[PDB]
Structure 1
Amino acid sequence: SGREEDPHEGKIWFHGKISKQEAYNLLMTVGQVSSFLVRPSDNTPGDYSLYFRTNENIQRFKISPTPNNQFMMGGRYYNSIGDIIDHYRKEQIVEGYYLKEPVPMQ
């Protein structure tokens, strides 16, 4: 390809080229409740946004890199975005909810 890609390009849950409205519409059509996807942040270069579908709405969470190869979400630190997804498949992300299926990059 000759490109240097985002380090998360090719991960099933990563969408590097959609809008926030497209994220909403994908989660409501392709996704199901507890589905999720990750986008680069629209407003903070270098950050990422995790979108999560509950029974009644979509929630957006900030993931921010540290200077030392880690990522911060909810005041906790993880070695990768994949580790954040592993964490919230086993611990509730919103009361009553875990991460279930990714919305695959379309």
Structure 2
Amino acid sequence: LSLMPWFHGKISGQEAVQQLQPPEDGLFLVRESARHPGDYVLCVSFGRDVIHYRVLHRDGHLTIDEAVFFCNLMDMVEHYSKDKGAICTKLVRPKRK
């Protein structure tokens, strides 16, 4: 959370595609969602495109229901820093400020 350099909180997606803009594989950040409150969107750069993955809540947290779920984002994040499978790419540099 707040003190995490990868978290930009409340910026339109629209902003994020921008932040993330000298493309660079695994360049990511995380922001709170608008249409569904309490929820997250993790933004990823991969192949010059920017992909997104809603973070759902289900007793906890996750992107692959059912698959892998977390206690903290600060931890889904770690997780997706060593094994990508599931999303397009391995998270590397957090975009920051």
Whether TM exceeds 0.5 here: the answer is yes
The sequence identity of aligned pairs, in percent, is 30
Q: 1:58 pairs with 13, 38, 50, which one?
A: 50
- Gaps of at least 5 residues in structure 1 are 1-7
The amino acid of 1:100's aligned partner reads V
- Higher-Rg member (1/2): 1
Residue 24 of structure 1 aligns to a residue in which SS? helix
Q: Please tell me whether the aligned partners of residues 6 and 94 of structure 2 are also in contact (alpha carbons under 8 angstroms).
A: yes
Q: Distance in 2 between matches of 1:19 and 1:46?
A: 15
Q: Distance in 1 between matches of 2:73 and 2:9?
A: 14
Q: How many residues align?
A: 93
Q: CA deviation at 1:23?
A: 0.5
Q: Distance in 2 between matches of 1:86 and 1:10?
A: 15
CA RMSD across the alignment: 1.5
Q: TM-score, normalised by structure 1?
A: 0.78
The amino acid of 1:22's aligned partner reads E
- Gaps of at least 5 residues in structure 2 are none
Q: Please tell me whether the aligned partners of residues 46 and 64 of structure 1 are also in contact (alpha carbons under 8 angstroms).
A: no
The amino acid of 1:58's aligned partner reads V
- Measured against aligned partners, the alpha-carbon deviations of 1:4-34 in whole angstroms (never above 9, x if no partner) come to xxxx1121100023221211011013x6221
Segments ≥4 residues shifted beyond 3 Å:
none
1:72 equivalenced with 2:62 (yes/no):
yes
Q: TM-score, normalised by structure 2?
A: 0.85
Q: Distance in 1 between matches of 2:42 and 2:79?
A: 13
